[PDB]
Amino acid sequence: SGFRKMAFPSGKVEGCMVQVTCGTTTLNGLWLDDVVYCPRHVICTNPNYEDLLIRKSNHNFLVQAGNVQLRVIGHSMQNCVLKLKVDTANPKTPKYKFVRIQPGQTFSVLACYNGSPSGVYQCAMRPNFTIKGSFLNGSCGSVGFNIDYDCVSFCYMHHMELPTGVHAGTDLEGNFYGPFVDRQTAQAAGTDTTITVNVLAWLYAAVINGDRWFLNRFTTTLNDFNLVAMKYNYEPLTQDHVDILGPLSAQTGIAVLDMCASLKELLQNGMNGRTILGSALLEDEFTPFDVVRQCSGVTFQ
């Protein structure tokens, strides 16, 4: 038992991290087969990246993979990411995919500096398309990912920090999550909301782990739940959410709509100085998947 914020084993991604240096900008890149993916603002000198990139040669890009100099033989820009074609394919390339995730979905982040991984933690893509990460200078280019058996599904590359200390970035094809753009002009996060289906998943995790104090005899309609949810800045719960929580409902014997009644009362009354899973807040960065994976034992390799 127990319940922890669990990242995927990072080793398959660690063997892909590289340093990309050109001019006075150094950042992290991601080396899969013979391409190195990195944020496009590595390009030298309110920017126009087309104009800036036609002015560069291959030999301007210094790519260090360990103690080895990688030779750039081609380059192209796709959205906000640069793709540097190197003369060597990465022997540690895992089976992988590029995936653009939906808000509410979680992933693991391997924080890197100078192509050297520093730590791994678990994140969610917030409803306003930021992540509450942990990132310092030089972290851009670090990626977020999920692993499914033997396949790394990369879903995030880090670019910037917003004034409120949250983080914005792109999928691996360079498309920002949310309305953000890669230039140092005024922009800010939209107002965020709580990921309701995830909170319910976490409540089910509590029940699986022996915590029951927050349950009740009440029930509620989907409509009536959403009316109280909206009041507490929670995302609406759809029938689709209900269906994903099906198998957790069936493991525990608590109908989804019964767990909604318990959540409703938690919102209306607070937790009164009690904790759920060692937390005094309702936690919303576990998906229904995350819960099932951690309380059944699904490994990856």
Added chain:
Amino acid sequence: SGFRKMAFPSGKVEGCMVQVTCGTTTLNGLWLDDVVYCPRHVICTNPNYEDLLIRKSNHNFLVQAGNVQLRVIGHSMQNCVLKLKVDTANPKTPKYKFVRIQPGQTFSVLACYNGSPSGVYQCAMRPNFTIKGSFLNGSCGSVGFNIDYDCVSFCYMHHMELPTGVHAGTDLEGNFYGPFVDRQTAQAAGTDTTITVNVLAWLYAAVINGDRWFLNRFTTTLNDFNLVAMKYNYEPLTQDHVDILGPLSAQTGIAVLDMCASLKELLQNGMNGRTILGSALLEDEFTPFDVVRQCSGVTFQ
């Protein structure tokens, strides 16, 4: 910015995990050079492990490393761990050390099942020498570790779960942390306490990240702080603790004893529906080291 519960990159340990099977017991083992380390209760059939181990041959131990059968050519028992000598040294062996940590020190856990890593999270060794982990059937043999530049310092191997859902285990030389023994007889955790120096470190992390609301104009003596600390089930703070928090004190300009005054008032008055670092509880599983590493940028390779 931001502040996350950050585990070390796990890749260096993932390449050491193996399956150890003998009789009807299968668990995880740790393959460094030509030895496989695993919990001794893999031994067949209130136990007497000497007697049980003299009755086994090498060919009773099935060790799977990937799709490869490892051949056991020797075995020895050291405390509660078994050391299986295999005919092949692990080519992915990192630079490493075996270290027995003090309570309050944190580490990363790579949860494994059948020699296949499942996830990584960060833990602390509680003052009562348990860890609040996340572990299912077949997780014993999973290790906890720290990384310092290029060196893995293994400090924990997992053995058992206690009735309260916390976890007990050994160092890599087989010595249990705490008073626990590896047999299925009544035993339970001592009463735990909060790791005071870690809570203070986390408060400094809050200040580094821009949170200041909990500070105050008051100050306090070391003695007077410990008198209120003891009342709230906190560990005593020693002058040695004070000195470790030195460099965090100097980064922030808040004398250690001034941060103690702020902690004192937090304990006496609660947090009044505010949060520190997205937490509504005082968090005690970050060491002063962890904070400095995460808010300065120390990498490892």
